[PDB]
């Protein structure tokens, strides 16, 4: 059944709750972003109001074929009324179109639902600065102190420098980048920009990217693989067998592959710096795992929460085990005693 952490009390609303059939008592279904564990269940047969960003609404219409009459896109940073209740959508610094949602309950309670987010100090100057938030529905993906990772900027500088050096040393090297969802577009776009190429990809992935309102996108991507020396492939193909196979397909245009796998966290984060990352190599194929995250590190999460000072925290990730739930509740209490709220 629908878990309690997907329901907004005092309303008829749910958040990211599309796989339970008709949730009894739900008058509006909000969708924070277009990732499959969150939209799971939506299709052209859905006949309840969906509230989301413009970009998420473009993906719902073009990829899932949800009918236009049920898609209700809202502008960001704007007070809107939904079924009698004031709401605001805020940028979540996750993937394109991802939002956090502020609910102002008729009784005076204010609720923030982060969706998935990568906390940033810029959020401390949004509309959140303007009033107290009582309850926080928090993306706790990386809520443990082992999870450190570099800034997105540091990671993109590493990728751009690595690719440019390799292709300038060998003009017959191909660059390949893995993907299995929206998000992390800066990785392949920044590498293609330094190389003066468009990124080549499948018709399905091109259609997806054309929904994202990215400026000048027609100048940056293409379905013509032959004209491109940065290719995108399914993350599943980013291994030596899949890449050897891909190289055969390019008809002797290339004699070397340099590939990137933008993972979340991996245990080499506890020991190694970004300047010291090395690839896995077999023959003329090299694969780099780069720690490009679209979720909060532990320290970013802790700074946001100690700033916001909520009265109550409801985790939305890692909630399925008693050991994970107890660990998280211990950190929440530490943070509250340290900061004095």
Only one of the segments 115-123, 254-262, 267-275, 297-305 lies at the binding site for Ni ion (rule: CB under 5 A); that segment is 115-123
Nearer to Ni ion, 209 or 230 (CB): 209
How many chain residues are in contact with Ni ion, going by CB under 5 A? 2
Q: How far is the CB of 94 from Ni ion (least distance, A)?
A: 6
Q: Any bridge partners for residue 256, and if so which?
A: 173
Q: How far is the CB of 116 from Ni ion (least distance, A)?
A: 4
10 within 8 A of 27, measured Cβ to Cβ: no
Q: How far is the CB of 96 from Ni ion (least distance, A)?
A: 11
Nearer to Ni ion, 73 or 264 (CB): 264
Return d(Cα 20, Cα 274) in angstroms, integer: 42
Nearer to Ni ion, 35 or 118 (CB): 35
**Longest Cα pair distance anywhere in the chain, in angstroms?**
68
Residue 16 is a binding residue for Ni ion (CB under 5 A): no
Residue 35 is a binding residue for Ni ion (CB under 5 A): yes
Return d(Cα 149, Cα 191) in angstroms, integer: 20
Q: How far is the CB of 140 from Ni ion (least distance, A)?
A: 13
Only one of the segments 35-43, 152-160, 171-179, 216-224 lies at the binding site for Ni ion (rule: CB under 5 A); that segment is 35-43
Nearer to Ni ion, 32 or 286 (CB): 32
Residue 295 is a binding residue for Ni ion (CB under 5 A): no
Q: How far is the CB of 185 from Ni ion (least distance, A)?
A: 14
Q: Can you tell me which of 16, 116, 185, 300 binds Ni ion, judged by CB under 5 A?
A: 116
Q: Which long-range contacts (CB under 8 A, 24 or more apart) does 166-169 make?
A: 166/256, 166/258, 167/195, 167/229, 167/258
Return d(Cα 276, Cα 280) in angstroms, integer: 13
> What x-and-dash track marks residues 68-107 binding Ni ion by CB under 5 A?
----------------------------------------
Nearer to Ni ion, 35 or 205 (CB): 35
The residues that touch Ni ion, with contacts defined as CB under 5 A, are 35, 116
């Amino acid at each position: 059944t629908c878990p309690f952490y997907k329901k907004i009390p005092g309303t008829g609303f749910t958040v990211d709750a599309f796989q339970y059939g008709v949730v009894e008592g739900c008058t509006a279904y909000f969708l924070t972003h277009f990732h499959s564990d969150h939209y799971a269940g939506l299709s052209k047969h859905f006949t309840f109001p969906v509230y989301c960003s413009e970009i998420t609404g473009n993906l719902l219409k073009n990829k899932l074929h949800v009918q236009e009459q049920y898609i209700h896109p809202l502008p960001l940073d704007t007070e809107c009324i939904v079924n009698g209740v004031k709401v605001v959508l805020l940028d979540a610094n996750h993937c394109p179109g991802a939002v956090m949602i502020l609910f102002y309950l008729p009784n005076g309670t204010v609720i923030l639902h982060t969706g998935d987010f990568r906390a940033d100090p810029s959020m401390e100057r949004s509309l959140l600065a303007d009033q107290k938030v009582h309850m926080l529905y928090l993306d706790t993906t990386y809520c443990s102190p082992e999870y450190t990772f570099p800034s997105q900027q540091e990671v993109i500088r590493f990728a751009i420098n690595t690719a440019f050096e390799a292709v300038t040393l060998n003009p017959h090297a191909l660059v390949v980048c893995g993907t299995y969802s929206i998000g992390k577009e800066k990785v392949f776009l920044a590498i293609a920009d330094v190389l003066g190429s468009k990124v080549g990809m499948s018709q399905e992935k091109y259609k997806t990217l054309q929904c994202l309102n990215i400026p000048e996108i027609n100048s940056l991507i293409t379905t013509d693989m032959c004209s491109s020396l940065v290719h995108l492939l399914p993350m599943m193909q980013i291994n030596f067998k899949g890449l050897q196979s891909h190289l055969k397909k390019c008809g002797g245009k290339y004699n070397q592959i340099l590939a990137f796998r933008p993972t979340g966290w991996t245990h080499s984060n506890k020991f190694t710096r970004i300047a010291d990352v090395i690839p896995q190599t077999k023959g003329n194929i090299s694969i780099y795992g780069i720690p490009y995250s679209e979720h909060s590190s532990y320290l970013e999460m802790k700074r946001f929460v100690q700033w916001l000072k909520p009265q109550k925290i409801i985790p939305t990730v890692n909630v399925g085990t008693w050991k994970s739930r107890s660990t998280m509740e211990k950190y929440f209490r530490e943070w509250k005693l340290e900061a004095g709220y």
